[PDB]
């Protein structure tokens, strides 16, 4: 807000305030200009859910169980820039820069730890109408990069762009015509790009201050450690905030 | 370095911080000459 901007740095630190997106006040309309460029879009999710096999009364249909985040306060995106292009039918947004990834890890019932990169990279938003309204609702696809960049070294010392490529303390595996092709999947490290679909919804606007904010819902796919396991579908919900300029 | 009226004594000043160690050794030399009694 501007109320957050009143504070100094020593009053914010250690209080968990910089993690939290602003609260926009009031509702009206604002029109995106021709050269309109979005300035301070922050996204913070308030709840997480992982698609699992749930234990109902007699059936095992797939449902979302929620989860507790374990990385502490590092989940919020910030400073996301981008120009707001005006197509004729629908106003669009394409993000350009800003902190658009925040790696985090949630824990399921059972003790399973599921990390996932929460990101909005290469987002193509499209929403009904032209002007931002309390009934406005935009969304679109984003590309999730892999959770580890290819020069990550696993405990044996094997990466996609560096490291070894065989079980380094098992030297008798590469004997014979077959070699170590039985454990081939854990040697080949494949950088993976998946898709994610976010759906935002503006409901409170200032036009005298040119800042909007509302509730979103985002679904994406968790990580796999370069093909080590099957990734799992992760749903999340929260609130965002943006400065329309 | 030292001011120009004092650049002459630049060797003597270099010895000076060592001199507090020499008081620790002066006690034992004095205890030797007294015969450790």
């Amino acid at each position: 807000k501007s109320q957050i901007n009143e504070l100094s740095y020593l009053q914010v630190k250690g209080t968990g305030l910089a993690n939290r997106c602003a609260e926009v006040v009031g509702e009206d309309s604002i029109k995106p200009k021709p050269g309109a460029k979005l300035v301070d879009m922050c996204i913070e999710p308030k709840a997480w859910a992982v698609e699992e096999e749930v234990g109902k009364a007699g059936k095992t249909e797939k449902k979302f169980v929620n989860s507790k985040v374990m990385t502490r306060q590092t989940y919020t995106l910030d400073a996301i820039e981008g120009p707001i292009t005006v197509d004729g039918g629908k106003i669009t947004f394409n993000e350009k820069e800003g902190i658009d990834y925040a790696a985090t890890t949630v824990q399921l019932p059972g003790g399973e730890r599921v990390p996932f990169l929460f990101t909005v990279k290469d987002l193509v938003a499209k929403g009904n109408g032209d002007t931002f309204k309390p009934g406005f609702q935009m969304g679109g696809d984003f590309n999730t990069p892999s959770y580890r960049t290819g020069l990550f070294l696993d405990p044996k010392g094997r990466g996609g762009t560096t490291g070894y490529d065989m079980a380094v303390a098992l030297p008798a595996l590469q004997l014979g015509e077959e070699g170590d092709a039985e454990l081939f999947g854990e040697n080949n490290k494949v950088f993976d790009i998946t898709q994610g679909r976010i759906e935002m919804e503006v409901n409170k606007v200032n036009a005298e201050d040119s800042e909007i904010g509302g509730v979103f819902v985002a679904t994406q796919l968790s990580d796999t450690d370069m093909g080590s396991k099957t990734p799992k579908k992760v749903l999340t919900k929260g609130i965002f905030y943006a400065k329309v300029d | 370095r030292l001011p120009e009226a004092y650049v002459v004594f630049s060797p003597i000043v270099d010895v000076l911080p060592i001199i507090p160690v020499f008081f620790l050794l002066l006690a034992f030399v004095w205890q030797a000459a007294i015969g450790f009694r």
Partner: protein, 59 residues
Amino acid sequence: MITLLVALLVLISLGLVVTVPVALATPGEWEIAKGKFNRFFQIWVFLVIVIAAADGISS
């Protein structure tokens, strides 16, 4: 003149340290002769003020 007086200030403090604890650890040497030595303290203190005077004039 500062380089001449400080050189005279060091040579007196050589002459004192060799002689003053010898004058004190002896059972009577300080009581028998201190008015001899008390001049050398008053000369030594007087040199510090002369050097402090000559340093302020020269700066």
